[PDB]
Amino acid sequence: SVYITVELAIAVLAILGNVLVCWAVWLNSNLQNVTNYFVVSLAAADILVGVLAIPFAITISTGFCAACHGCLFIACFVLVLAQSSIFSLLAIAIDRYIAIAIPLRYNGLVTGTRAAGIIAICWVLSFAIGLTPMLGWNNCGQPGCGEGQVACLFEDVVPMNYMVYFNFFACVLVPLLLMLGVYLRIFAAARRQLKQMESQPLPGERARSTLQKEVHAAKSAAIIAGLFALCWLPLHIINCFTFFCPDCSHAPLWLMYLAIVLAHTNSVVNPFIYAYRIREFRQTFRKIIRS
Ligand SMILES: CCCn1c(=O)c2[nH]c(-c3ccc(OCC(=O)NCCN)cc3)nc2n(CCC)c1=O
């Protein structure tokens, strides 16, 4: 009952953490910029983790009896909160690039309306993809509970070719390669901006201070994105060994859940990574708590 306790501990932190973030964005209007619109999506997503994803993962770990629809949802719900966080983290990457690359067209393109528009689309695509196994890509009844109910054991109810080719490579590895590819252009150009501002006949520390505050936000966004891959790769890497190499000793359970716990921990780093990186956030929280 240790894994249960640990999973329950993360559930609390994942709620309190991201809920606190959603509150600070509501109170302090200095955080209600188009950028943090996606951050809220990342928060809400990482809230449902400690609200449904984890409660589901703890239930499906022991396995239960239910229809294919009810079983797949409880099995592929985490794939929704994981996919949404991909779009949120991707947008934040693009966004931070737009600000540094084209600061002028930033306010013209990056609008508080298009943001809410893309987010909605991202969520819709997150359910279509994250719940593709529910469309037909499943192992329900492939060569106890009785007719009508299927032993809801994930590895038995959800394919591996999907978790690898479709989910991992295409819906995780590729994005994280675009994201990393984006940050490559960000800091590469950001340091060029500082070099051009190095041959200017005037001080203009305003464009510098603003540039260093745009980079300080693009870097903070890089650390948020970086922690995602750092907390999901282990789980996927494990599934690449089991699939591509049937011979390779199927990963142990004591090491399997660790890659699962690590994936639920990612939902908690975001709140704490704001209170540290962004000085504007920590002061906002500090006020909420006291009062
Ligand atoms: C790309 C990842 C694909 N993928 C998995 O490979 C996976 N594996 C397990 C999984 C779950 C429980 C296990 O043992 C529980 C146990 O006995 N613990 C004892 C601790 N002392 C083993 C494996 N859940 C998984 N899910 C999530 C499905 C909702 C998933 O999406």
Coordinates of C-alpha atoms in Angstrom, one line a residue, residues 15-277:
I15 CA -4.4 19.7 -7.4
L16 CA -3.2 22.3 -4.9
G17 CA -0.3 23.2 -7.1
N18 CA -2.1 23.8 -10.5
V19 CA -5.3 25.1 -8.8
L20 CA -3.2 27.7 -7.0
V21 CA -1.8 28.7 -10.5
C22 CA -5.3 29.0 -12.0
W23 CA -6.2 31.2 -9.1
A24 CA -3.2 33.6 -9.4
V25 CA -4.0 34.0 -13.1
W26 CA -7.5 35.1 -12.0
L27 CA -6.6 37.5 -9.3
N28 CA -3.5 39.2 -10.7
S29 CA -4.3 40.7 -14.1
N30 CA -0.6 41.1 -14.7
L31 CA -0.5 37.4 -15.6
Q32 CA -3.5 37.4 -17.9
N33 CA -1.4 37.7 -21.0
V34 CA -2.0 35.6 -24.1
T35 CA 1.0 33.5 -23.1
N36 CA -0.4 32.3 -19.8
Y37 CA -3.7 31.4 -21.5
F38 CA -2.0 28.2 -22.6
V39 CA -0.4 27.8 -19.2
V40 CA -3.9 27.6 -17.8
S41 CA -4.7 24.8 -20.2
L42 CA -1.5 23.1 -18.9
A43 CA -2.8 23.6 -15.4
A44 CA -6.3 22.4 -15.9
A45 CA -4.9 19.3 -17.7
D46 CA -2.4 18.6 -14.9
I47 CA -5.3 19.1 -12.4
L48 CA -7.4 16.4 -13.9
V49 CA -4.3 14.2 -13.4
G50 CA -4.6 14.3 -9.7
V51 CA -8.4 14.3 -10.0
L52 CA -9.1 11.5 -12.5
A53 CA -5.9 10.2 -14.2
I54 CA -4.3 9.1 -11.0
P55 CA -7.5 7.8 -9.4
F56 CA -8.0 5.8 -12.6
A57 CA -4.4 4.6 -12.8
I58 CA -4.7 3.2 -9.2
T59 CA -7.9 1.5 -10.1
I60 CA -6.7 0.0 -13.4
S61 CA -3.5 -1.2 -11.8
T62 CA -5.3 -3.8 -9.8
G63 CA -7.7 -4.3 -12.7
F64 CA -11.5 -4.4 -12.6
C65 CA -14.6 -5.5 -14.6
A66 CA -16.4 -3.2 -17.0
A67 CA -17.5 -2.8 -20.7
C68 CA -14.9 -2.0 -23.4
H69 CA -16.1 1.7 -23.5
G70 CA -15.9 2.2 -19.8
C71 CA -12.6 0.3 -19.6
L72 CA -10.8 2.1 -22.4
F73 CA -11.8 5.5 -21.1
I74 CA -10.3 4.8 -17.7
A75 CA -7.2 3.4 -19.5
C76 CA -6.8 6.1 -22.2
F77 CA -7.9 9.2 -20.1
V78 CA -4.3 9.8 -19.1
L79 CA -3.4 9.8 -22.8
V80 CA -5.7 12.8 -23.1
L81 CA -4.1 14.9 -20.4
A82 CA -0.7 13.9 -21.8
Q83 CA -1.6 14.9 -25.3
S84 CA -3.1 18.3 -24.3
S85 CA 0.0 19.2 -22.4
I86 CA 1.9 18.5 -25.6
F87 CA 0.0 21.2 -27.5
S88 CA 0.1 23.6 -24.5
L89 CA 3.9 23.2 -24.2
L90 CA 4.3 23.4 -28.0
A91 CA 2.2 26.6 -28.3
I92 CA 4.1 28.2 -25.4
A93 CA 7.3 27.4 -27.3
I94 CA 6.0 28.9 -30.5
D95 CA 4.6 31.9 -28.6
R96 CA 7.9 32.7 -26.8
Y97 CA 9.6 32.4 -30.2
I98 CA 7.1 34.9 -31.8
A99 CA 7.8 37.5 -29.1
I100 CA 11.6 37.4 -29.6
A101 CA 11.6 36.8 -33.4
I102 CA 8.9 39.3 -34.3
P103 CA 7.9 41.5 -31.3
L104 CA 5.9 43.8 -33.5
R105 CA 3.6 41.3 -35.0
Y106 CA 3.4 39.5 -31.6
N107 CA 0.6 41.7 -30.3
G108 CA -1.1 41.4 -33.7
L109 CA -0.9 37.6 -34.2
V110 CA -0.7 36.3 -30.6
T111 CA -4.2 37.5 -29.5
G112 CA -6.2 36.6 -26.4
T113 CA -8.9 35.3 -28.8
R114 CA -6.8 33.1 -31.1
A115 CA -5.2 31.6 -27.9
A116 CA -8.6 30.4 -26.5
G117 CA -9.4 29.2 -30.0
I118 CA -6.3 27.1 -30.5
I119 CA -6.5 25.6 -27.0
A120 CA -10.1 24.4 -27.7
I121 CA -8.9 22.8 -30.9
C122 CA -6.0 21.3 -29.1
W123 CA -8.3 19.7 -26.5
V124 CA -10.6 18.3 -29.2
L125 CA -7.6 16.8 -31.0
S126 CA -6.4 15.5 -27.7
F127 CA -9.6 13.5 -27.2
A128 CA -9.6 12.2 -30.8
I129 CA -6.1 11.0 -30.5
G130 CA -5.9 10.1 -26.8
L131 CA -9.1 8.0 -27.3
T132 CA -8.3 6.5 -30.6
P133 CA -8.1 3.0 -29.0
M134 CA -11.8 3.6 -28.2
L135 CA -12.5 4.1 -31.9
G136 CA -11.3 0.6 -32.7
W137 CA -7.6 0.3 -32.1
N138 CA -7.9 -2.0 -29.1
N139 CA -7.3 -5.5 -27.9
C140 CA -10.7 -6.2 -26.5
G141 CA -11.2 -10.0 -26.4
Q142 CA -8.0 -10.9 -28.2
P143 CA -6.7 -14.4 -27.7
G144 CA -13.7 -14.2 -14.8
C145 CA -15.8 -11.1 -15.4
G146 CA -18.4 -12.8 -17.6
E147 CA -20.0 -11.8 -20.9
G148 CA -20.4 -8.1 -21.4
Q149 CA -17.5 -7.2 -19.0
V150 CA -13.8 -7.4 -19.9
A151 CA -10.9 -7.8 -17.5
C152 CA -9.8 -4.2 -17.6
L153 CA -6.1 -4.8 -17.5
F154 CA -4.3 -2.1 -19.5
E155 CA -1.7 -4.2 -21.3
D156 CA -4.5 -6.5 -22.3
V157 CA -7.1 -3.9 -23.3
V158 CA -4.8 -1.4 -25.0
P159 CA -2.4 -2.3 -27.9
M160 CA 1.3 -1.7 -27.9
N161 CA 1.7 -0.8 -31.6
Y162 CA -0.5 2.2 -30.8
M163 CA 1.4 3.2 -27.6
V164 CA 4.6 3.1 -29.7
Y165 CA 4.1 4.1 -33.3
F166 CA 1.0 6.3 -33.1
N167 CA 1.2 7.6 -29.6
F168 CA 4.9 7.8 -28.7
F169 CA 6.8 8.5 -32.0
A170 CA 4.1 10.6 -33.7
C171 CA 2.2 12.3 -30.9
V172 CA 5.1 12.7 -28.5
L173 CA 8.6 12.2 -30.0
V174 CA 7.9 14.4 -33.0
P175 CA 6.4 17.3 -31.1
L176 CA 9.3 17.2 -28.6
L177 CA 11.5 17.3 -31.7
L178 CA 9.7 20.4 -33.1
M179 CA 9.7 22.0 -29.7
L180 CA 13.4 21.4 -29.1
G181 CA 13.9 22.6 -32.7
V182 CA 12.0 25.8 -31.9
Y183 CA 14.1 26.6 -28.8
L184 CA 17.1 26.1 -31.0
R185 CA 16.0 29.1 -33.2
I186 CA 14.9 31.1 -30.2
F187 CA 18.2 31.3 -28.2
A188 CA 20.1 31.3 -31.5
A189 CA 18.3 34.5 -32.7
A190 CA 18.1 36.0 -29.2
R191 CA 21.9 36.0 -28.9
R192 CA 22.0 37.6 -32.4
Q193 CA 19.6 40.3 -31.2
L194 CA 22.1 41.1 -28.4
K195 CA 24.9 41.2 -31.0
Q196 CA 23.1 43.7 -33.2
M197 CA 22.4 45.8 -30.2
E198 CA 26.1 45.7 -29.7
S199 CA 26.8 47.9 -32.7
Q200 CA 24.3 50.6 -32.0
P201 CA 25.2 54.3 -31.7
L202 CA 22.8 54.5 -28.7
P203 CA 22.4 52.8 -25.3
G204 CA 18.8 51.7 -25.6
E205 CA 18.8 49.4 -22.6
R206 CA 15.0 49.3 -22.9
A207 CA 15.2 47.0 -25.9
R208 CA 17.9 45.0 -24.0
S209 CA 16.1 44.7 -20.7
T210 CA 12.9 43.7 -22.6
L211 CA 14.9 41.2 -24.7
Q212 CA 16.4 39.6 -21.6
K213 CA 13.0 39.4 -20.0
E214 CA 11.6 37.8 -23.2
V215 CA 14.5 35.3 -23.1
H216 CA 14.0 34.7 -19.4
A217 CA 10.4 33.7 -20.2
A218 CA 11.4 31.6 -23.3
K219 CA 14.0 29.8 -21.1
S220 CA 11.5 29.2 -18.3
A221 CA 9.2 27.8 -21.0
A222 CA 12.1 25.6 -22.1
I223 CA 12.5 24.2 -18.6
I224 CA 8.8 23.4 -18.4
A225 CA 8.9 21.6 -21.7
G226 CA 12.1 19.9 -20.9
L227 CA 10.7 18.4 -17.7
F228 CA 7.9 16.8 -19.7
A229 CA 10.1 14.6 -21.9
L230 CA 12.3 14.0 -18.8
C231 CA 9.2 12.5 -17.1
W232 CA 7.6 10.6 -19.9
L233 CA 10.6 9.2 -21.9
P234 CA 11.3 6.5 -19.2
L235 CA 7.7 5.2 -19.6
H236 CA 7.9 5.3 -23.4
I237 CA 11.4 3.9 -23.5
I238 CA 10.2 1.0 -21.4
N239 CA 7.5 0.4 -24.0
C240 CA 9.9 0.5 -26.8
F241 CA 12.0 -2.3 -25.2
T242 CA 9.0 -4.5 -24.7
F243 CA 7.6 -4.0 -28.2
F244 CA 10.5 -3.8 -30.5
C245 CA 12.4 -6.4 -28.6
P246 CA 10.0 -9.2 -27.4
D247 CA 13.1 -11.1 -26.2
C248 CA 14.2 -8.2 -24.0
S249 CA 13.1 -9.1 -20.5
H250 CA 9.7 -7.4 -20.1
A251 CA 10.3 -4.5 -17.7
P252 CA 9.6 -5.5 -14.1
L253 CA 6.5 -4.2 -12.3
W254 CA 8.5 -2.5 -9.5
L255 CA 10.3 -0.6 -12.2
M256 CA 7.2 -0.2 -14.4
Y257 CA 5.2 1.8 -11.8
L258 CA 8.2 4.0 -11.2
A259 CA 8.0 5.1 -14.8
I260 CA 4.3 5.6 -14.2
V261 CA 4.7 7.6 -11.0
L262 CA 7.4 9.6 -12.7
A263 CA 4.8 10.5 -15.4
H264 CA 2.3 11.7 -12.8
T265 CA 5.0 13.8 -11.1
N266 CA 5.3 15.9 -14.2
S267 CA 1.9 17.5 -13.3
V268 CA 3.4 18.9 -10.1
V269 CA 6.6 20.5 -11.4
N270 CA 4.8 23.2 -13.3
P271 CA 3.4 25.1 -10.3
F272 CA 6.7 25.0 -8.4
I273 CA 8.6 25.8 -11.5
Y274 CA 6.7 29.1 -11.8
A275 CA 7.1 30.2 -8.2
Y276 CA 10.8 29.8 -8.7
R277 CA 11.5 31.1 -12.3

